Amino acid sequence: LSQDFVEALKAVVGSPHVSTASAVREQHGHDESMHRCQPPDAVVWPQNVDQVSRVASLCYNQGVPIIPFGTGTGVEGGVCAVQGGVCINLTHMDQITELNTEDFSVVVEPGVTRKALNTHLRDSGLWFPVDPGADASLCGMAATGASGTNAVRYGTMRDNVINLEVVLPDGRLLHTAGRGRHYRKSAAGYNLTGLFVGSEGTLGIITSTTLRLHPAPEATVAATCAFPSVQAAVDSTVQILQAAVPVARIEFLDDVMMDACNRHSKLNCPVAPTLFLEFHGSQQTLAEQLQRTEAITQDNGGSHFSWAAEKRNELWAARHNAWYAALALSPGSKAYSTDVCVPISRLPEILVETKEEIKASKLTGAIVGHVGDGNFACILLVDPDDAEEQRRVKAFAENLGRRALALGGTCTGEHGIGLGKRQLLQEEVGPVGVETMRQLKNTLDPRGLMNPGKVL
Numbered sequence: 001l002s003q004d005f006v007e008a009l010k011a012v013v014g015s016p017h018v019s020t021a022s023a024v025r026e027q028h029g030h031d032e033s034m035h036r037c038q039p040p041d042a043v044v045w046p047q048n049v050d051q052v053s054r055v056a057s058l059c060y061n062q063g064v065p066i067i068p069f070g071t072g073t074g075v076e077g078g079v080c081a082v083q084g085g086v087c088i089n090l091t092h093m094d095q096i097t098e099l100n101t102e103d104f105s106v107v108v109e110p111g112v113t114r115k116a117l118n119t120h121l122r123d124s125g126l127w128f129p130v131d132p133g134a135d136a137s138l139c140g141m142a143a144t145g146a147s148g149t150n151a152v153r154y155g156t157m158r159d160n161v162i163n164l165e166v167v168l169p170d171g172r173l174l175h176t177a178g179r180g181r182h183y184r185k186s187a188a189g190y191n192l193t194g195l196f197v198g199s200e201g202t203l204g205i206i207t208s209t210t211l212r213l214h215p216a217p218e219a220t221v222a223a224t225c226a227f228p229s230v231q232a233a234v235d236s237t238v239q240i241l242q243a244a245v246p247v248a249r250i251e252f253l254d255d256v257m258m259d260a261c262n263r264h265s266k267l268n269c270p271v272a273p274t275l276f277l278e279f280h281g282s283q284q285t286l287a288e289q290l291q292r293t294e295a296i297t298q299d300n301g302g303s304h305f306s307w308a309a310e311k312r313n314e315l316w317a318a319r320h321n322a323w324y325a326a327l328a329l330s331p332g333s334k335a336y337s338t339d340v341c342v343p344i345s346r347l348p349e350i351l352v353e354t355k356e357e358i359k360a361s362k363l364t365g366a367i368v369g370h371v372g373d374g375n376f377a378c379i380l381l382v383d384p385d386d387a388e389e390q391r392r393v394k395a396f397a398e399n400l401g402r403r404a405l406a407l408g409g410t411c412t413g414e415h416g417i418g419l420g421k422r423q424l425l426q427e428e429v430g431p432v433g434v435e436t437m438r439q440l441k442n443t444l445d446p447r448g449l450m451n452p453g454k455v456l
Ligand SMILES: Cc1cc2nc3c(=O)[nH]c(=O)nc-3n(C[C@H](O)[C@H](O)[C@H](O)COP(=O)(O)OP(=O)(O)OC[C@H]3O[C@@H](n4cnc5c(N)ncnc54)[C@H](O)[C@@H]3O)c2cc1C
Pocket: 031, 032, 067, 068, 069, 070, 071, 072, 073, 074, 075, 077, 078, 079, 090, 110, 131, 132, 133, 134, 136, 137, 139, 140, 141, 142, 143, 144, 145, 146, 147, 148, 149, 200, 201, 202, 204, 205, 206, 207, 320, 321, 322, 323, 324, 414, 415, 418, 451, 454
Protein backbone atom coordinates (compact mmCIF):
# COMPACT_ATOMS: atom_id res chain seq x y z
CA LEU A 1 0.00 0.00 0.00
CA SER A 2 1.73 3.18 -1.26
CA GLN A 3 2.82 6.00 0.99
CA ASP A 4 1.06 8.51 -1.27
CA PHE A 5 -2.14 6.61 -0.49
CA VAL A 6 -1.34 6.56 3.23
CA GLU A 7 -0.75 10.32 3.21
CA ALA A 8 -4.12 10.79 1.52
CA LEU A 9 -5.80 8.84 4.32
CA LYS A 10 -4.03 10.97 6.94
CA ALA A 11 -5.17 14.10 5.11
CA VAL A 12 -8.78 13.02 5.75
CA VAL A 13 -8.76 11.72 9.33
CA GLY A 14 -5.53 13.05 10.84
CA SER A 15 -2.18 11.32 11.31
CA PRO A 16 -3.03 9.76 14.74
CA HIS A 17 -6.10 8.07 13.20
CA VAL A 18 -4.22 6.08 10.50
CA SER A 19 -2.00 3.14 11.34
CA THR A 20 0.06 0.80 9.17
CA ALA A 21 1.76 -0.87 12.16
CA SER A 22 1.70 -4.67 12.02
CA ALA A 23 0.49 -5.11 15.60
CA VAL A 24 -2.39 -2.66 15.13
CA ARG A 25 -3.35 -4.27 11.81
CA GLU A 26 -3.20 -7.75 13.34
CA GLN A 27 -5.58 -6.72 16.13
CA HIS A 28 -8.05 -5.65 13.43
CA GLY A 29 -7.64 -8.71 11.21
CA HIS A 30 -9.79 -11.11 13.21
CA ASP A 31 -12.95 -11.30 15.27
CA GLU A 32 -13.89 -13.66 18.10
CA SER A 33 -14.16 -16.65 15.70
CA MET A 34 -11.53 -19.28 14.83
CA HIS A 35 -11.06 -17.71 11.37
CA ARG A 36 -7.37 -17.13 10.82
CA CYS A 37 -6.25 -13.55 11.29
CA GLN A 38 -5.87 -11.75 7.95
CA PRO A 39 -4.53 -8.26 8.74
CA PRO A 40 -5.64 -5.23 6.73
CA ASP A 41 -2.96 -3.08 5.15
CA ALA A 42 -4.03 -0.12 7.32
CA VAL A 43 -6.51 0.79 10.05
CA VAL A 44 -8.32 4.14 9.87
CA TRP A 45 -10.52 5.78 12.53
CA PRO A 46 -12.81 8.38 10.95
CA GLN A 47 -14.04 11.06 13.34
CA ASN A 48 -17.28 12.03 11.56
CA VAL A 49 -19.44 10.95 8.66
CA ASP A 50 -17.81 13.40 6.24
CA GLN A 51 -14.53 11.62 6.94
CA VAL A 52 -16.14 8.19 6.46
CA SER A 53 -17.39 9.33 3.07
CA ARG A 54 -14.01 10.71 2.03
CA VAL A 55 -12.12 7.59 3.20
CA ALA A 56 -14.55 5.36 1.32
CA SER A 57 -14.28 7.44 -1.86
CA LEU A 58 -10.49 7.45 -1.66
CA CYS A 59 -10.34 3.65 -1.21
CA TYR A 60 -13.02 2.87 -3.76
CA ASN A 61 -11.53 4.98 -6.57
CA GLN A 62 -8.04 3.62 -5.88
CA GLY A 63 -9.17 -0.01 -6.00
CA VAL A 64 -8.44 -0.58 -2.29
CA PRO A 65 -10.81 -2.92 -0.37
CA ILE A 66 -12.76 -1.48 2.57
CA ILE A 67 -13.49 -3.51 5.70
CA PRO A 68 -15.92 -1.93 8.21
CA PHE A 69 -14.99 -2.72 11.79
CA GLY A 70 -17.17 -2.19 14.84
CA THR A 71 -16.23 -3.96 18.05
CA GLY A 72 -14.78 -7.06 16.35
CA THR A 73 -17.04 -9.51 18.24
CA GLY A 74 -18.41 -11.19 15.11
CA VAL A 75 -18.59 -14.90 14.47
CA GLU A 76 -17.77 -15.56 10.80
CA GLY A 77 -14.59 -13.65 10.00
CA GLY A 78 -16.47 -10.62 8.74
CA VAL A 79 -13.54 -8.32 9.55
CA CYS A 80 -10.85 -10.65 8.14
CA ALA A 81 -9.08 -8.71 5.39
CA VAL A 82 -8.92 -11.55 2.90
CA GLN A 83 -7.84 -9.17 0.09
CA GLY A 84 -5.98 -6.70 2.30
CA GLY A 85 -7.14 -3.10 2.14
CA VAL A 86 -8.25 -0.47 4.64
CA CYS A 87 -10.00 -1.46 7.87
CA ILE A 88 -12.32 1.37 8.94
CA ASN A 89 -12.78 1.30 12.72
CA LEU A 90 -15.95 3.31 13.31
CA THR A 91 -15.99 3.42 17.09
CA HIS A 92 -14.74 6.97 17.64
CA MET A 93 -18.15 8.14 16.40
CA ASP A 94 -19.82 7.29 19.70
CA GLN A 95 -22.65 9.80 20.20
CA ILE A 96 -26.30 9.14 21.00
CA THR A 97 -28.60 11.64 19.29
CA GLU A 98 -32.23 12.35 18.49
CA LEU A 99 -33.54 10.65 21.62
CA ASN A 100 -37.32 10.81 21.14
CA THR A 101 -38.75 9.15 24.23
CA GLU A 102 -42.30 10.15 23.28
CA ASP A 103 -41.89 8.28 19.97
CA PHE A 104 -39.82 5.38 21.42
CA SER A 105 -36.85 6.02 19.12
CA VAL A 106 -33.19 7.05 19.28
CA VAL A 107 -30.24 7.47 16.88
CA VAL A 108 -26.85 5.91 17.68
CA GLU A 109 -23.39 6.13 16.08
CA PRO A 110 -21.20 3.01 15.68
CA GLY A 111 -19.24 3.50 18.89
CA VAL A 112 -22.41 3.24 21.02
CA THR A 113 -22.84 -0.22 22.54
CA ARG A 114 -26.06 -1.61 23.98
CA LYS A 115 -24.78 -1.12 27.53
CA ALA A 116 -23.97 2.53 26.81
CA LEU A 117 -27.43 3.14 25.34
CA ASN A 118 -29.28 1.45 28.17
CA THR A 119 -27.18 3.33 30.74
CA HIS A 120 -28.04 6.59 28.97
CA LEU A 121 -31.69 5.53 29.19
CA ARG A 122 -32.14 4.56 32.84
CA ASP A 123 -34.78 6.72 34.57
CA SER A 124 -36.38 7.18 31.13
CA GLY A 125 -38.58 4.11 31.53
CA LEU A 126 -37.33 2.90 28.14
CA TRP A 127 -34.72 0.33 27.14
CA PHE A 128 -33.26 -1.27 24.04
CA PRO A 129 -33.87 -5.03 24.18
CA VAL A 130 -31.73 -6.78 21.52
CA ASP A 131 -28.98 -8.36 23.61
CA PRO A 132 -26.12 -10.35 22.07
CA GLY A 133 -23.83 -11.67 24.76
CA ALA A 134 -20.95 -9.36 23.86
CA ASP A 135 -21.33 -5.64 24.37
CA ALA A 136 -21.16 -5.01 20.64
CA SER A 137 -21.50 -1.91 18.48
CA LEU A 138 -25.21 -1.33 17.84
CA CYS A 139 -24.39 -0.43 14.23
CA GLY A 140 -22.39 -3.67 13.99
CA MET A 141 -25.47 -5.45 15.32
CA ALA A 142 -27.52 -3.81 12.57
CA ALA A 143 -24.87 -4.90 10.04
CA THR A 144 -24.99 -8.55 11.13
CA GLY A 145 -28.75 -8.76 11.73
CA ALA A 146 -28.15 -9.73 15.37
CA SER A 147 -30.66 -11.02 17.86
CA GLY A 148 -30.37 -11.99 21.51
CA THR A 149 -32.17 -13.59 24.45
CA ASN A 150 -34.88 -10.90 24.41
CA ALA A 151 -35.71 -11.35 20.70
CA VAL A 152 -38.36 -14.04 21.27
CA ARG A 153 -40.56 -11.28 22.74
CA TYR A 154 -39.08 -7.96 21.62
CA GLY A 155 -37.74 -8.77 18.13
CA THR A 156 -34.39 -8.94 16.32
CA MET A 157 -32.38 -6.04 14.90
CA ARG A 158 -34.50 -6.42 11.77
CA ASP A 159 -37.61 -5.78 13.87
CA ASN A 160 -36.08 -2.87 15.78
CA VAL A 161 -34.10 -0.93 13.14
CA ILE A 162 -36.31 1.88 11.78
CA ASN A 163 -33.72 3.82 9.73
CA LEU A 164 -30.04 3.57 8.80
CA GLU A 165 -27.48 6.15 7.73
CA VAL A 166 -25.16 4.40 5.26
CA VAL A 167 -22.04 5.59 3.48
CA LEU A 168 -22.19 3.72 0.17
CA PRO A 169 -18.95 2.21 -1.19
CA ASP A 170 -18.17 5.19 -3.42
CA GLY A 171 -18.82 7.64 -0.56
CA ARG A 172 -22.40 8.75 -1.22
CA LEU A 173 -24.56 9.24 1.88
CA LEU A 174 -27.87 7.32 2.03
CA HIS A 175 -30.52 7.57 4.72
CA THR A 176 -32.37 4.36 3.96
CA ALA A 177 -35.80 5.63 5.07
CA GLY A 178 -35.02 9.33 4.55
CA ARG A 179 -32.92 11.75 6.60
CA GLY A 180 -34.27 12.18 10.10
CA ARG A 181 -37.33 9.99 9.57
CA HIS A 182 -38.79 7.68 12.17
CA TYR A 183 -42.21 6.06 12.21
CA ARG A 184 -44.02 2.82 12.93
CA LYS A 185 -44.76 1.68 9.37
CA SER A 186 -44.44 2.79 5.76
CA ALA A 187 -45.32 1.62 2.25
CA ALA A 188 -43.31 4.44 0.61
CA GLY A 189 -41.24 2.94 -2.17
CA TYR A 190 -38.98 -0.07 -1.65
CA ASN A 191 -37.91 -0.72 1.92
CA LEU A 192 -34.19 0.01 1.79
CA THR A 193 -33.66 -0.28 5.55
CA GLY A 194 -34.21 -4.03 5.50
CA LEU A 195 -31.68 -4.52 2.70
CA PHE A 196 -28.84 -3.06 4.75
CA VAL A 197 -29.69 -4.91 7.97
CA GLY A 198 -27.69 -8.12 7.81
CA SER A 199 -25.48 -6.93 4.96
CA GLU A 200 -22.29 -7.47 7.04
CA GLY A 201 -20.43 -4.49 5.59
CA THR A 202 -20.66 -5.73 1.99
CA LEU A 203 -23.17 -3.07 0.83
CA GLY A 204 -21.94 0.05 2.62
CA ILE A 205 -20.87 1.48 5.95
CA ILE A 206 -23.53 2.06 8.61
CA THR A 207 -22.70 5.37 10.30
CA SER A 208 -25.86 5.62 12.37
CA THR A 209 -28.84 3.46 13.27
CA THR A 210 -32.30 4.63 14.30
CA LEU A 211 -33.55 2.14 16.90
CA ARG A 212 -36.96 1.27 18.31
CA LEU A 213 -37.06 1.61 22.10
CA HIS A 214 -39.41 -0.34 24.37
CA PRO A 215 -41.10 0.40 27.70
CA ALA A 216 -39.38 -1.16 30.67
CA PRO A 217 -41.50 -4.03 32.06
CA GLU A 218 -43.67 -3.28 35.08
CA ALA A 219 -42.32 -6.35 36.87
CA THR A 220 -39.77 -9.05 36.05
CA VAL A 221 -39.25 -12.65 37.22
CA ALA A 222 -36.36 -14.88 36.11
CA ALA A 223 -35.93 -18.57 36.87
CA THR A 224 -34.06 -21.69 35.86
CA CYS A 225 -35.59 -25.10 35.25
CA ALA A 226 -33.65 -28.37 35.06
CA PHE A 227 -34.78 -31.26 32.87
CA PRO A 228 -34.01 -34.99 32.69
CA SER A 229 -33.12 -34.84 29.00
CA VAL A 230 -32.53 -32.54 26.05
CA GLN A 231 -35.74 -33.93 24.53
CA ALA A 232 -37.72 -32.85 27.61
CA ALA A 233 -36.32 -29.31 27.65
CA VAL A 234 -36.91 -28.70 23.96
CA ASP A 235 -40.39 -30.26 23.98
CA SER A 236 -41.23 -27.87 26.82
CA THR A 237 -39.93 -24.96 24.75
CA VAL A 238 -42.04 -25.91 21.72
CA GLN A 239 -45.13 -26.39 23.87
CA ILE A 240 -44.63 -23.05 25.65
CA LEU A 241 -44.49 -21.27 22.28
CA GLN A 242 -47.48 -23.17 20.89
CA ALA A 243 -49.42 -22.23 24.04
CA ALA A 244 -48.63 -18.59 23.16
CA VAL A 245 -47.11 -17.74 26.55
CA PRO A 246 -45.45 -14.34 25.89
CA VAL A 247 -42.20 -15.29 27.64
CA ALA A 248 -39.56 -12.55 27.63
CA ARG A 249 -36.57 -14.92 27.54
CA ILE A 250 -36.33 -18.67 27.00
CA GLU A 251 -32.75 -19.93 26.69
CA PHE A 252 -31.46 -23.50 26.47
CA LEU A 253 -28.20 -24.85 27.89
CA ASP A 254 -27.29 -28.50 27.61
CA ASP A 255 -25.62 -30.18 30.57
CA VAL A 256 -22.11 -29.48 29.21
CA MET A 257 -22.93 -25.79 28.79
CA MET A 258 -24.59 -25.58 32.20
CA ASP A 259 -21.50 -27.06 33.86
CA ALA A 260 -19.26 -24.70 31.86
CA CYS A 261 -21.31 -21.68 32.98
CA ASN A 262 -21.27 -22.91 36.59
CA ARG A 263 -17.47 -23.02 36.54
CA HIS A 264 -17.14 -19.62 34.83
CA SER A 265 -19.63 -17.62 36.92
CA LYS A 266 -20.24 -19.32 40.30
CA LEU A 267 -23.76 -20.00 39.42
CA ASN A 268 -24.39 -23.41 40.96
CA CYS A 269 -27.26 -24.77 38.92
CA PRO A 270 -27.87 -28.53 38.80
CA VAL A 271 -25.77 -29.89 35.93
CA ALA A 272 -28.54 -30.85 33.50
CA PRO A 273 -30.18 -29.60 30.30
CA THR A 274 -31.66 -26.35 31.56
CA LEU A 275 -33.95 -23.51 30.55
CA PHE A 276 -33.23 -19.97 31.68
CA LEU A 277 -36.59 -18.16 31.67
CA GLU A 278 -37.73 -14.60 32.18
CA PHE A 279 -41.27 -13.21 32.36
CA HIS A 280 -42.43 -9.60 32.01
CA GLY A 281 -45.71 -8.06 33.08
CA SER A 282 -47.82 -6.92 35.99
CA GLN A 283 -48.27 -9.06 39.09
CA GLN A 284 -51.54 -10.43 37.68
CA THR A 285 -50.06 -11.28 34.27
CA LEU A 286 -46.88 -12.77 35.73
CA ALA A 287 -48.74 -15.20 37.99
CA GLU A 288 -50.80 -16.40 35.04
CA GLN A 289 -47.78 -16.81 32.75
CA LEU A 290 -45.86 -18.65 35.47
CA GLN A 291 -48.77 -21.02 36.11
CA ARG A 292 -49.19 -21.94 32.45
CA THR A 293 -45.43 -22.27 31.92
CA GLU A 294 -44.82 -24.37 35.04
CA ALA A 295 -47.67 -26.67 33.99
CA ILE A 296 -45.94 -27.34 30.67
CA THR A 297 -42.45 -27.82 32.09
CA GLN A 298 -43.92 -30.10 34.78
CA ASP A 299 -45.47 -32.24 32.02
CA ASN A 300 -41.94 -32.81 30.66
CA GLY A 301 -40.16 -33.45 33.95
CA GLY A 302 -38.90 -29.94 34.63
CA SER A 303 -37.88 -29.05 38.16
CA HIS A 304 -39.72 -26.53 40.25
CA PHE A 305 -38.51 -23.13 39.10
CA SER A 306 -35.37 -21.87 40.82
CA TRP A 307 -36.13 -18.18 41.21
CA ALA A 308 -33.80 -15.25 40.64
CA ALA A 309 -31.97 -7.48 40.98
CA GLU A 310 -28.47 -8.90 41.42
CA LYS A 311 -29.41 -12.54 40.99
CA ARG A 312 -31.12 -12.14 37.61
CA ASN A 313 -28.18 -9.93 36.62
CA GLU A 314 -25.81 -12.75 37.60
CA LEU A 315 -28.01 -15.27 35.78
CA TRP A 316 -28.09 -13.42 32.47
CA ALA A 317 -24.45 -12.33 32.74
CA ALA A 318 -23.54 -16.02 32.93
CA ARG A 319 -25.72 -16.77 29.91
CA HIS A 320 -24.24 -13.86 27.96
CA ASN A 321 -20.73 -15.18 28.70
CA ALA A 322 -21.54 -18.79 27.74
CA TRP A 323 -19.15 -18.58 24.79
CA TYR A 324 -16.24 -17.74 27.08
CA ALA A 325 -17.37 -20.32 29.66
CA ALA A 326 -17.13 -22.94 26.91
CA LEU A 327 -13.66 -21.74 25.86
CA ALA A 328 -12.52 -21.82 29.49
CA LEU A 329 -13.23 -25.58 29.57
CA SER A 330 -10.16 -26.24 27.42
CA PRO A 331 -7.84 -23.25 27.94
CA GLY A 332 -5.96 -21.86 24.97
CA SER A 333 -8.60 -23.32 22.66
CA LYS A 334 -10.54 -21.50 20.02
CA ALA A 335 -13.92 -22.64 18.75
CA TYR A 336 -16.36 -22.55 15.88
CA SER A 337 -20.07 -21.87 16.40
CA THR A 338 -23.04 -23.03 14.37
CA ASP A 339 -26.29 -21.05 14.33
CA VAL A 340 -29.09 -22.92 12.57
CA CYS A 341 -32.71 -21.85 12.90
CA VAL A 342 -35.55 -24.23 12.01
CA PRO A 343 -39.36 -24.23 12.10
CA ILE A 344 -40.10 -24.63 15.81
CA SER A 345 -41.88 -27.94 15.47
CA ARG A 346 -38.65 -29.42 14.01
CA LEU A 347 -36.44 -28.05 16.83
CA PRO A 348 -36.65 -31.16 19.08
CA GLU A 349 -35.62 -33.47 16.24
CA ILE A 350 -32.59 -31.48 15.14
CA LEU A 351 -31.35 -30.47 18.53
CA VAL A 352 -31.60 -34.02 19.90
CA GLU A 353 -29.94 -35.31 16.71
CA THR A 354 -27.12 -32.79 17.21
CA LYS A 355 -26.53 -34.04 20.75
CA GLU A 356 -26.45 -37.62 19.47
CA GLU A 357 -24.07 -36.68 16.65
CA ILE A 358 -21.74 -34.88 19.06
CA LYS A 359 -21.61 -38.06 21.15
CA ALA A 360 -20.90 -40.36 18.21
CA SER A 361 -17.80 -38.37 17.14
CA LYS A 362 -14.43 -37.56 18.67
CA LEU A 363 -15.47 -33.90 18.67
CA THR A 364 -16.48 -32.19 21.88
CA GLY A 365 -19.18 -29.56 21.93
CA ALA A 366 -21.63 -27.58 24.03
CA ILE A 367 -25.11 -26.42 23.03
CA VAL A 368 -26.68 -23.10 24.00
CA GLY A 369 -29.50 -21.35 22.29
CA HIS A 370 -32.27 -18.88 21.61
CA VAL A 371 -34.65 -21.80 21.32
CA GLY A 372 -37.73 -19.58 21.58
CA ASP A 373 -36.84 -18.59 17.99
CA GLY A 374 -36.15 -22.18 16.93
CA ASN A 375 -32.44 -21.24 16.98
CA PHE A 376 -29.39 -22.70 18.72
CA ALA A 377 -25.59 -22.66 18.67
CA CYS A 378 -23.23 -25.62 18.75
CA ILE A 379 -19.90 -24.49 20.22
CA LEU A 380 -17.14 -26.74 18.85
CA LEU A 381 -13.74 -26.48 20.46
CA VAL A 382 -10.75 -26.58 18.08
CA ASP A 383 -7.02 -26.89 18.62
CA PRO A 384 -5.69 -24.09 16.37
CA ASP A 385 -2.80 -26.34 15.27
CA ASP A 386 -4.73 -29.63 14.77
CA ALA A 387 -5.76 -29.45 11.12
CA GLU A 388 -7.26 -32.95 11.25
CA GLU A 389 -9.66 -31.82 13.99
CA GLN A 390 -10.51 -28.58 12.20
CA ARG A 391 -11.76 -30.37 9.13
CA ARG A 392 -13.90 -32.74 11.20
CA VAL A 393 -15.36 -29.71 12.96
CA LYS A 394 -15.96 -27.98 9.63
CA ALA A 395 -17.53 -31.16 8.24
CA PHE A 396 -19.77 -31.40 11.32
CA ALA A 397 -20.86 -27.77 11.06
CA GLU A 398 -21.66 -28.14 7.34
CA ASN A 399 -23.65 -31.32 7.98
CA LEU A 400 -25.66 -29.63 10.74
CA GLY A 401 -26.32 -26.67 8.46
CA ARG A 402 -27.51 -28.98 5.69
CA ARG A 403 -29.78 -30.85 8.11
CA ALA A 404 -31.38 -27.53 9.07
CA LEU A 405 -31.87 -26.69 5.39
CA ALA A 406 -33.48 -30.09 4.85
CA LEU A 407 -36.04 -29.18 7.55
CA GLY A 408 -37.01 -25.92 5.80
CA GLY A 409 -34.84 -23.75 8.06
CA THR A 410 -31.90 -21.41 7.63
CA CYS A 411 -28.18 -21.91 8.13
CA THR A 412 -27.92 -18.85 10.40
CA GLY A 413 -30.51 -17.33 12.67
CA GLU A 414 -28.44 -14.33 13.71
CA HIS A 415 -24.63 -14.60 13.36
CA GLY A 416 -24.47 -14.23 9.59
CA ILE A 417 -22.47 -15.75 6.77
CA GLY A 418 -19.07 -14.02 6.67
CA LEU A 419 -16.45 -16.44 5.38
CA GLY A 420 -17.87 -19.60 6.89
CA LYS A 421 -21.36 -20.23 5.51
CA ARG A 422 -21.09 -19.07 1.89
CA GLN A 423 -21.69 -22.53 0.42
CA LEU A 424 -24.64 -23.13 2.74
CA LEU A 425 -26.17 -19.81 1.64
CA GLN A 426 -25.98 -20.90 -2.01
CA GLU A 427 -27.85 -24.10 -1.13
CA GLU A 428 -30.37 -22.22 1.02
CA VAL A 429 -31.61 -19.70 -1.57
CA GLY A 430 -30.71 -21.46 -4.80
CA PRO A 431 -29.44 -20.08 -8.11
CA VAL A 432 -32.05 -17.36 -8.58
CA GLY A 433 -31.68 -16.20 -4.98
CA VAL A 434 -27.89 -16.07 -5.30
CA GLU A 435 -27.98 -14.17 -8.59
CA THR A 436 -30.52 -11.70 -7.20
CA MET A 437 -28.42 -11.05 -4.08
CA ARG A 438 -25.37 -10.66 -6.28
CA GLN A 439 -27.17 -8.17 -8.52
CA LEU A 440 -27.94 -6.02 -5.48
CA LYS A 441 -24.33 -6.34 -4.33
CA ASN A 442 -23.16 -5.24 -7.78
CA THR A 443 -25.31 -2.14 -8.07
CA LEU A 444 -24.18 -0.78 -4.70
CA ASP A 445 -20.56 -2.04 -4.97
CA PRO A 446 -19.69 -2.30 -8.69
CA ARG A 447 -15.95 -2.74 -8.13
CA GLY A 448 -16.43 -5.41 -5.46
CA LEU A 449 -14.34 -3.47 -2.92
CA MET A 450 -16.89 -3.39 -0.06
CA ASN A 451 -15.62 -6.16 2.30
CA PRO A 452 -14.72 -8.62 -0.48
CA GLY A 453 -14.95 -12.35 0.02
CA LYS A 454 -17.89 -12.25 2.46
CA VAL A 455 -21.49 -13.52 2.20
CA LEU A 456 -21.46 -14.12 -1.58
C1 LIG B 1 -19.73 -13.87 23.80
C2 LIG B 1 -20.46 -13.51 22.54
C3 LIG B 1 -21.85 -13.64 22.49
C4 LIG B 1 -22.56 -13.31 21.33
N1 LIG B 1 -23.95 -13.45 21.33
C5 LIG B 1 -24.60 -13.13 20.20
C6 LIG B 1 -26.05 -13.28 20.19
O1 LIG B 1 -26.75 -13.70 21.10
N2 LIG B 1 -26.64 -12.91 18.98
C7 LIG B 1 -25.97 -12.44 17.86
O2 LIG B 1 -26.63 -12.13 16.85
N3 LIG B 1 -24.61 -12.32 17.89
C8 LIG B 1 -23.97 -12.65 19.01
N4 LIG B 1 -22.60 -12.48 19.05
C9 LIG B 1 -21.90 -12.08 17.80
C10 LIG B 1 -21.60 -10.59 17.69
O3 LIG B 1 -21.55 -9.98 18.98
C11 LIG B 1 -22.65 -9.93 16.80
O4 LIG B 1 -22.61 -10.51 15.50
C12 LIG B 1 -22.45 -8.42 16.68
O5 LIG B 1 -23.55 -7.88 15.95
C13 LIG B 1 -21.15 -8.07 16.00
O6 LIG B 1 -20.92 -6.65 16.10
P1 LIG B 1 -19.46 -6.08 16.01
O7 LIG B 1 -19.52 -4.56 15.82
O8 LIG B 1 -18.66 -6.53 17.20
O9 LIG B 1 -18.95 -6.80 14.69
P2 LIG B 1 -17.59 -6.88 13.88
O10 LIG B 1 -16.94 -8.18 14.12
O11 LIG B 1 -16.80 -5.60 14.06
O12 LIG B 1 -18.18 -6.90 12.41
C14 LIG B 1 -19.15 -7.89 12.01
C15 LIG B 1 -19.48 -7.73 10.55
O13 LIG B 1 -20.25 -6.53 10.35
C16 LIG B 1 -19.52 -5.59 9.58
N5 LIG B 1 -19.71 -4.28 10.21
C17 LIG B 1 -19.45 -3.92 11.50
N6 LIG B 1 -19.79 -2.69 11.79
C18 LIG B 1 -20.35 -2.21 10.62
C19 LIG B 1 -20.90 -0.97 10.26
N7 LIG B 1 -21.01 0.08 11.09
N8 LIG B 1 -21.34 -0.83 8.99
C20 LIG B 1 -21.25 -1.86 8.15
N9 LIG B 1 -20.75 -3.08 8.38
C21 LIG B 1 -20.30 -3.19 9.63
C22 LIG B 1 -18.08 -6.09 9.52
O14 LIG B 1 -17.49 -5.67 8.28
C23 LIG B 1 -18.27 -7.60 9.62
O15 LIG B 1 -18.53 -8.22 8.36
C24 LIG B 1 -21.86 -12.85 20.20
C25 LIG B 1 -20.47 -12.71 20.25
C26 LIG B 1 -19.77 -13.04 21.40
C27 LIG B 1 -18.27 -12.89 21.42
